[PDB]
Amino acid sequence: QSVGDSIFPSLGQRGLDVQHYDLHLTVPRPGEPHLSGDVTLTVGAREPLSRIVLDLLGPRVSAAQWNGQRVRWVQTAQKVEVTLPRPLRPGETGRLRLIYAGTPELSGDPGLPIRPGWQNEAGLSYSLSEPHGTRGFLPCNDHPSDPATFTVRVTVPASASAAASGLFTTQTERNGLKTLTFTQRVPVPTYALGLIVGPLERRTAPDVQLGTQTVHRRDIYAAGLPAGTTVPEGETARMLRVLSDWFGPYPDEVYGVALLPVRQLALETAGLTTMPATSNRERVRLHALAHQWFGDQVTLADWADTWLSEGFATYAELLWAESQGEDGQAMAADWYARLSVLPSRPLRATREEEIFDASAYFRGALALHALRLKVGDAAFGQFLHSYVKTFTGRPVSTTALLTLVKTQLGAEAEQTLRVWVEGRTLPPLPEP
């Protein structure tokens, strides 16, 4: 019934394909966890579904409709189960509307320093929900194998403002409440939905032209940022140019960061990375932008494969550094030095504690480094382009990566990657 994730075996619904979330979120007091929601999901199915089973953790559903009609539904501790009048069958779509309100719950953190979900701090409420926190404030198929598009209408006090992933279109004001509308038009995982409410400023920059593609530029600055918390002019443009030349077209219509005066890790929310000021460094800004491809466009089939996101986004930092004239092998050697004094593992994680560990970042990055040195920069660059296209609209797995390497780069290239993917001991440092 669930997706059957190796790490989180209860999340999601098997065969469920949510294509679009139309969310109206109302935050009465930014900084306080209470909220209310009105969401319509446009859902498809990959296998016949007699029910729609969504993840929800905290708020209480008060009403549900299926294609405009009253429908039978029950809410458990962590699920909303909607009995459909008839099975939803592949090729068909329906619209599930849920009315809900209450207090989002944070998913317990046994792996990361973040308890993921709806965060409340310093007059700010915002999503920091990787891996399974989005269900706290949004009834969702909470699994990266099912990305979707989002249209979000956020209602906040007039004194406040809001920013969500996607292009900002309208703001209206009535009875002391503002409503802002954002349109995420390319599909991303549930946790990649950025959503921040409170005292925030929108700042635009000139468009970035990437040969037959225009990328809009805007950052968000919340109040109370430390002195010197900035995105310096033109850096995002040069990063977009270097990364897209390596990976292919930037998958979204806008990019920027939302700089927050809190102390947490950066999260790669789509087209608008949620960036605590503590993490606002050049390498982290590159890292988060690389995730727009690897993580947000290319999504995981299973949470055990986080290195396909974290390792790829980490290696992009080395590709960027070399683009700025730096010595990439030295950076690779530094990564290796840091891993050499830590326990190592195969890249496919077996436990939740591992999915964001040092192996996922740096052993994954060095896995790509081994492959690149084996096949050369030209072949490696064409593989990255082929990889992104192969796994757009189809979730990626470690096995599928190795199969792709075998057909595209050959059996020797595949076994080079396999030494780094499999095997408990950390292999020697990859060298030219």
Ligand X SMILES: N[C@@H](Cc1c[nH]c2ccccc12)C(=O)O
Region binding ligand X by CB under 6 A among candidate stretches 12-20, 64-72, 262-270, 322-330 = 262-270
Rule CB under 6 A: say whether 268 interacts with ligand X. Answer: yes
Find which of Zn ion, ligand X, none residue 128 binds, CB within 5 to 8 Å per kind. Answer: ligand X
**Distance, CA of 136 to CA of 118 (rounded, Å):** 6
Phi and psi angles of residue 87, each rounded to the nearest 5 degrees, phi first: -65, 135
Q: Is the dihedral of CA 310, 316, 317, 318 positive or negative?
A: positive
Find which of Zn ion, ligand X, none residue 219 binds, CB within 5 to 8 Å per kind. Answer: none
Rule CB under 6 A: say whether 112 interacts with ligand X. Answer: yes
Please provide the DSSP assignment of 207-247 as one string.
EEE-SS-EEEEEEEEETTPPTT----TTHHHHHHHHHHHHH
Rule CB under 6 A: say whether 106 interacts with ligand X. Answer: no
CB of 316 to Zn ion, least distance (A): 10
| DSSP label at residue 251 | S
CB of 360 to Zn ion, least distance (A): 9
CB of 418 to ligand X, least distance (A): 25
Please provide the DSSP assignment of 370-395 as one string.
HHHHHHHHHHHHHHHHHHHHHTTTS-
Q: Which of 265, 333, 400, 402 binds ligand X (CB under 6 A)?
A: 265
**Distance, CA of 370 to CA of 402 (rounded, Å):** 13
Instruction: Give the tokens for residue 89.
Output: 């069958």
Closest to ligand X by CB, 274 vs 416, is: 274
Which x/- pattern, by CB under 6 A, does the window 277-296 give for ligand X?
----------x---x-----
Nearest residue to ligand X by CB is: 130
Q: Which of 163, 267, 300, 349 binds ligand X (CB under 6 A)?
A: 267
Region binding ligand X by CB under 6 A among candidate stretches 112-120, 240-248, 251-259, 316-324 = 112-120
| Terminal-to-terminal C-alpha distance of the chain | 48
Region binding ligand X by CB under 6 A among candidate stretches 237-245, 260-268, 318-326, 330-338 = 260-268
Find which of Zn ion, ligand X, none residue 356 binds, CB within 5 to 8 Å per kind. Answer: ligand X
Find which of ligand X, Zn ion, none residue 112 binds, CB within 5 to 8 Å per kind. Answer: ligand X
Q: How far is CA 131 from CA 84, 259, 300, 304, in A?
A: 28, 21, 11, 11
**Distance, CA of 323 to CA of 191 (rounded, Å):** 30
| DSSP label at residue 290 | H
Q: What is the CA radius of gyration of the chain?
A: 21
The count of C-alpha atoms lying within 13 angstroms of the C-alpha of 165, restricted to the half-sphere facing its C-beta, is 30
Closest to ligand X by CB, 285 vs 374, is: 285
Closest to Zn ion by CB, 313 vs 396, is: 313
In single-letter form, the type of residue at position 170 comes to T
Find which of ligand X, Zn ion, none residue 252 binds, CB within 5 to 8 Å per kind. Answer: none
Interface positions with Zn ion (CB under 5 A): 310, 313
- Please report, as ranges, the residues that interact with ligand X according to CB under 6 A: 112, 114, 116, 128, 130, 265, 267-268, 287, 291, 356
